[PDB]
Structure 1
């Protein structure tokens, strides 16, 4: 069958499933952005923009 490094080639001639895979990728990335923001808000100390700003 297909080697492991070729599994996604099933999408080349399947525009609908390619759109699905792209939707899933987009869902993952947007989910990352959301999760990352939440984790940052759960750890961020807003009490000192002078000596403890976000980049520290």
Structure 2
């Protein structure tokens, strides 16, 4: 019986699995950038600055 907020604690020690974590919140952000980036890009109108 390990409650959820405590579930991300898993690692704390074992920096290995953790690297892969940050290695993700990092691959998840980067994505979002290119993501909405495309999006906004899919809508910005240049017609008049």
Cα displacement string for residues 3-38 of structure 1 (whole angstroms, at most 9, x for unaligned residues): 011111111011010100000100000000000110
TM-score (ref. length: structure 1): 0.80
TM-score (ref. length: structure 2): 0.90
Q: Which runs of 5+ in 2 are unaligned?
A: none
> Where in structure 1 do 4 or more consecutive aligned residues deviate above 6 Å?
none
